[PDB]
């Protein structure tokens, strides 16, 4: 739809589900990444950094 993306998943395009920041600084969906990564590769999609699912973390969206 409207072309513009705000903390959002390009995975799915999707607003981040859970939300987990990888080391890479970029926040995905806590499924999305881990579907992308133990599936095709461990990277993330956007900038092909070495993504692990122990490396990631959920943020806190509580401060
Ligand atoms: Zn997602
Ligand atoms: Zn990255």
């Given at each position: 739809?409207?072309?513009?993306?705000?903390?959002?998943?390009?995975i799915?395009?999707?607003?981040?589900?859970?939300?987990?920041?990888?080391?890479?600084?970029?926040?995905?969906?806590?499924?999305?990444?881990?579907?992308?990564?133990?599936?095709?590769?461990?990277?993330?999609?956007?900038?092909?950094?070495?993504?692990?699912?122990?490396?990631?973390?959920?943020?806190?969206?509580?401060?």
């Amino acid at each position: 739809g409207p072309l513009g993306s705000k903390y959002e998943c390009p995975i799915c395009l999707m607003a981040l589900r859970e939300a987990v920041q990888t080391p890479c600084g970029h926040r995905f969906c806590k499924a999305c990444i881990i579907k992308s990564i133990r599936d095709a590769g461990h990277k993330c999609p956007v900038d092909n950094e070495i993504l692990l699912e122990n490396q990631l973390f959920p943020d806190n969206f509580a401060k």
